[PDB]
Design a protein around this ligand. Structure first.
Ligand SMILES: CCc1ccc(CN(C)C(=O)CCc2nnc(CCc3c[nH]c4ccccc34)o2)cc1
Ligand code: NI
Length: 149
């Protein structure tokens, strides 16, 4: 077999069960989702309250299940506005035990400029591209268009 097949095995057995975002300054829920936004090869859409743009720090919880073991599960996210990448984020979970369900909590502090850009201009014009990796092995690339409501 080969690295490409190993990456497909991981993807086959992976799923995102639920996700939430909280305002880190209060611990209050801002948004909750239950779509598996890890699914590649299609474009997804997420509708999120515009208050998220005005938060200096957002705590994100991603709950996921993995059939396969991963030595170093990590994410790369890029935020594109009208085709231009305005921000890049790197997150690391680490070792994933086979046949496990896990909650990954990450603090996200977006660029201060994003807190003043009008939601009316951003809405429907932002794509978050996420690349799921096991160390340097690309498992999936997903794309989600954001709407700020
Ligand atoms: C790994 C699984 C997974 C997949 C997809 C998603 C994508 N989703 C649904 C969200 O990220 C929701 C929260 C949200 N909406 N806009 C933002 C930041 C905007 C922003 C930050 N810097 C900027 C600079 C300029 C303009 C806008 C911005 O964050 C989350 C998790
Ligand atoms: Ni082989």
């Amino acid at each position: 077999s080969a690295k490409d097949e190993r990456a497909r095995e991981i993807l086959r057995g992976f799923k995102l069960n639920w996700m939430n975002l909280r305002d880190a300054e209060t611990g209050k829920i801002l948004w909750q989702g239950t779509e598996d936004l890890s699914v590649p090869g299609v474009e997804h859409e997420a509708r999120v309250p515009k208050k998220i743009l005005k938060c200096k720090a957002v705590s994100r919880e991603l709950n996921f299940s993995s059939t396969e073991q991963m030595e170093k599960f990590r994410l790369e996210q890029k935020v594109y506005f009208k085709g231009q990448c305005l921000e890049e984020w790197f997150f690391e979970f680490g070792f994933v035990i086979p046949n496990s369900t896990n909650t990954w909590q990450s603090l996200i502090e977006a660029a201060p400029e994003s807190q003043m850009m009008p939601a009316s201009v951003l809405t429907g014009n932002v794509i978050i591209e996420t690349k799921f990796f096991d160390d340097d092995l690309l498992v999936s690339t997903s794309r989600v268009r954001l709407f700020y409501v």
